[PDB]
Swiss-Prot record:
The record marks 256, 259 as: Involved in NS3 ATPase and RTPase activities. It is found in: Host endoplasmic reticulum membrane. This is Serine protease/Helicase NS3. The chain holds residues 1692 to 2122 of 3433 of the full protein. Residues 1-415 are cytoplasmic. Signal peptide: none annotated. Acetylated by host KAT5. Acetylation modulates NS3 RNA-binding and unwinding activities and plays an important positive role for viral replication. The lineage of its organism: Viruses, Riboviria, Orthornavirae, Kitrinoviricota, Flasuviricetes. Displays three enzymatic activities: serine protease, NTPase and RNA helicase. NS3 serine protease, in association with NS2B, performs its autocleavage and cleaves the polyprotein at dibasic sites in the cytoplasm: C-prM, NS2A-NS2B, NS2B-NS3, NS3-NS4A, NS4A-2K and NS4B-NS5. NS3 RNA helicase binds RNA and unwinds dsRNA in the 3' to 5' direction. NS3 supports the separation of RNA daughter and template strands during viral replication. The helicase part is involved in the inhibition of phosphorylation of host STAT1, and thereby inhibition of host type-I IFN signaling. ATP binds at residues 8-15. A motif (DEAH box) lies at residues 94-97. Residues 1-146 form the Helicase ATP-binding domain.
Length: 415
């Protein structure tokens, strides 16, 4: 009948205490449950916590077993595929604030099904999509201090950063600015861990809390309040850039501040941020990619799934705009898992009528679409073929912008 939101503020007792109780009572009522988690870590956190109950933990390809434990991306990938889906009665989502394309899509699927009367849902999150309060309430008091935060290294000044004793989580605008800041701290004789994709330490430097960061005591969060995020350009034929670090959503800032001030015994925890938040996200590729996914989901009675209401003002297309029909849906799916291509790109490709094996498109593009390795056109040798420079018909900054990523796109254009 309804979608329920547990605004359970930070403090890692959610999986520990409450989850098994929800599921435990979800089993006596004989309800078909899907438990949805945003990462492998968390979905393995949920394994360790649900010891003793009937559970099918799945990566997913009557009897007694009635609940499933899976990643958001697993649900959507099955929903998109032409294979059966369990008719769930209950959906329970952990960290329902994730703006990953699949998680926005899965959140929409569920939202349509509750509105259809088909099921019930529990969303778990500190910062429910819709909310824009950067300073949420929490267990322990947090000291909020806006001061200037270095974007790079620094010789002297910011004497507060290093003079401080304790442990610190630094959220940095980008992965490359991480390196610098990190080295800088190391030179000051500070023990630092970088994490992008041991115990005795002073600093953790993060791109985002999605990777790692689970139950690790710190006393200070240094927050640059920026992050790099893929954007779509309208004109051209479509394009995705990975642009200069921009302002984060307040919900996103909330989640970072969330790392500190959750231990009632420790009262002098603090949060130093520089820069304000920005709610305008419309231009972020992730929404469009989410919409492409839900468009390509088959639903009862011929309907197209709508977005979760709070998130409906982010997409400008209407429903079924990105629908793929026939052999196209197949090529699309092929390029998602096997090829490991971003949803935008896979769609662009598949929708144009090209096939999973026709690697031509990565070469017959305009002069301006030439991918630069250092600042030089890349050489890629094909299957005993020619010397053709990489020049794709569609540019998506994701597939080369990161050094490991380029090799695999190279390995993709090869065969």
């Amino acid at each position: 009948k309804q979608i329920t939101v547990l605004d359970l503020h930070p403090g890692a007792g959610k999986t520990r205490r409450i989850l098994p109780q929800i599921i435990k009572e979800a089993i006596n009522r004989r309800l078909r449950t899907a438990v949805l988690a945003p990462t492998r870590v968390v979905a393995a956190e949920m394994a360790e916590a649900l010891r003793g109950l009937p559970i099918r933990y799945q990566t997913s390809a009557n009897g007694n077993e009635i609940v499933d434990v899976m990643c958001h991306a697993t649900l959507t990938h099955r929903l998109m595929s032409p294979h059966r889906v369990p008719n769930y009665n209950l959906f329970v989502m952990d960290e329902a604030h994730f703006t990953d394309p699949a998680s926005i899509a899965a959140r929409g699927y569920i939202s349509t099904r509750v509105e259809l009367g088909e099921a019930a849902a529990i969303f778990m999150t500190a910062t429910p999509p819709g909310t824009s309060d950067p300073f949420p309430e929490s267990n322990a008091p947090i000291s909020d201090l806006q001061t200037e935060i270095p974007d790079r290294a620094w010789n002297s000044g910011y004497e507060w950063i290093t003079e401080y004793i304790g442990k610190t989580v630094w959220f940095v605008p980008s992965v490359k600015m991480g390196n610098e800041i990190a080295l800088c701290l190391q030179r000051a004789g500070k023990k630092v861990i970088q994490l992008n994709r041991n115990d005795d330490w002073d600093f953790v430097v993060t791109t985002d809390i999605s990777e790692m960061g689970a139950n690790f005591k710190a006393s200070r969060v240094i927050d640059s309040r920026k992050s790099v995020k893929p954007t779509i350009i309208t004109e051209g034929e479509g394009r995705v850039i990975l642009g200069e670090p921009s302002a984060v959503t307040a919900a996103s800032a909330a989640q970072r501040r969330g790392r500190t001030g959750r231990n009632p015994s420790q009262a002098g925890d603090e949060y130093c941020y520089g820069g304000h938040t920005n709610e305008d996200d419309s231009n972020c590729a992730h929404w469009t990619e989410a919409r492409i996914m839900l468009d390509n989901i088959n639903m009862p009675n011929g309907l197209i799934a709508q977005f979760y209401q709070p998130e409906r003002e982010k997409v400008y297309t209407m429903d079924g705009e990105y629908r793929l029909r026939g052999e196209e849906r197949k090529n699309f799916l092929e390029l998602l898992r096997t090829a490991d291509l971003p949803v935008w790109l896979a769609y662009k490709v598949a929708a144009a009528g090209v096939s999973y094996h026709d690697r031509r498109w990565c070469f017959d593009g305009p002069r301006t679409n030439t991918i630069l390795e250092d600042n030089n056109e890349v050489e890629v040798i094909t299957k005993l073929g020619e010397r053709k420079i990489l020049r794709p018909r569609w540019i998506d900054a994701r597939v080369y912008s990161d050094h490991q990523a380029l090799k695999s796109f190279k390995d993709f254009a090869s065969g």
